[PDB]
């Protein structure tokens, strides 16, 4: 994302593979999450993998 | 107030149940805040000070 000001936050756009209602036929899905509710997954250099 | 005009989104989580989420922000993103009148707070806190 891009706001560049710091006076306002944005919400991080995150995407995830979902177990659909017929279980084993996945489809990727996205939702907006407030930043305090999301954490990076690992100490590795990947800045694009996050965990709740 | 929260001036952001959020819009909801639905995601399926296993059979027969849904997980609601935010999917869009209509309009310009803006800051959430609370407003208190200085004219009341300034009086009130010295009133609290005497006590």
């Amino acid at each position, epitope marked *: 994302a891009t706001v560049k*000001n710091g006076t306002v936050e944005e919400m991080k756009n995150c995407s995830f593979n979902t177990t659909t209602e017929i279980r084993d036929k996945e489809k990727k899905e996205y939702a907006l999450f407030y930043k305090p509710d999301i954490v990076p997954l690992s100490e590795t250099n990947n800045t694009s993998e996050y965990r709740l | 107030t929260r*001036p952001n005009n959020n819009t909801r989104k639905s995601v399926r989580i296993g059979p027969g149940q849904t997980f609601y989420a935010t999917g869009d922000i209509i*309009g*310009d993103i803006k800051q959430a805040h609370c407003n208190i009148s200085e004219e009341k707070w300034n009086d009130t806190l010295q009133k609290v000070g005497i006590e």
Partner: antibody, heavy 126, light 110 residues
Framework: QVQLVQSGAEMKKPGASVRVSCKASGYTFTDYYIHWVRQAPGQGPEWMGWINPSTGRTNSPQKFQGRVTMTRDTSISTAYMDLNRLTSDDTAMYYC????????????????????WGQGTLVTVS | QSALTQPASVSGSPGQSITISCTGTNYDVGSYNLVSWYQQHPGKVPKYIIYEVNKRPSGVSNRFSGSKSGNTASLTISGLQAEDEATYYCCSYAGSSIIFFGGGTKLTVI
């Protein structure tokens, strides 16, 4: 004195894209919305979108969503509209206008308060 | 009829008023106080006449006034003089960060 000036008139053949520019002097460029308004010959003006010059958010109506790209350069106080996949219906004068005041605590983007207008520049697809 | 509807033209005598109406729907004109009026003329840029449904910016002669009720707004030009002969558009907020314009209304002072 607040004033805005745009690029010059031009001829362009169908199907191409056009970069029309708008520059304003007399106020801090980041603190007022820039609204794009188009008037085809003799027709009522139609509104294309708005730009937040402070952060770069933009929005467009249903028919224009996906064929006009809008941005700006803060370093030179000049706003840019990039209409793409041109057609004959784009023959019009393109106007740059000054919108509502920008503040953190309220969304004044939708206010149709066009305080000032540019001189208008011509596109003709034929 | 461009996006909003209005009478296309009216002609009258000086001293009276030609009042131009702007119509109309719940989501555009009925919902919000954000209605403006713009005057245009052959070979001219639009002129900014009314804002926030009842206020006028500096430079607009004080013969104008604005009004609104229900789903329809109107522009009052009370005390007509031959300078007012021009094409008048209405435009307002339309929800979801969209704004709509009107079709125009020419004026005459016989």
């Amino acid at each position: 004195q607040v004033q805005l000036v745009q690029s010059g008139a031009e001829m362009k053949k169908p199907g191409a894209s056009v970069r029309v520019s708008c520059k304003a002097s007399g106020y801090t460029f980041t603190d007022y919305y820039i609204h794009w308004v188009r008037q085809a010959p003799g027709q009522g003006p139609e509104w294309m979108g708005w730009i937040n010059p402070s952060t770069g958010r933009t929005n467009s109506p249903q028919k224009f969503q996906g064929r006009v790209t809008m941005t700006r350069d803060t370093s030179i106080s000049t706003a840019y509209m990039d209409l793409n996949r041109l057609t004959s219906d784009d023959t019009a004068m393109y106007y740059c206008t000054t919108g509502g005041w920008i503040g953190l605590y309220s969304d004044t983007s939708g206010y149709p308060n066009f305080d000032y207008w540019g001189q208008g520049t011509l596109v003709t697809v034929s | 009829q461009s996006a909003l509807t209005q009478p296309a033209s009216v002609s009258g005598s000086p001293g009276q008023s030609i009042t131009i109406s702007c119509t109309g729907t719940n989501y555009d004109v009925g919902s919000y106080n954000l209605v403006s009026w713009y005057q245009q003329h052959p070979g001219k840029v639009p002129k900014y006449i009314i804002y926030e449904v009842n206020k006028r910016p500096s430079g607009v002669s004080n013969r104008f006034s604005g009004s609104k009720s229900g789903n329809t707004a109107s522009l009052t030009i009370s005390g007509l003089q031959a300078e007012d002969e021009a094409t008048y558009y209405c435009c307002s907020y339309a929800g979801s960060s969209i704004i709509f314009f009107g079709g125009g209304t020419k004026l005459t002072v016989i």
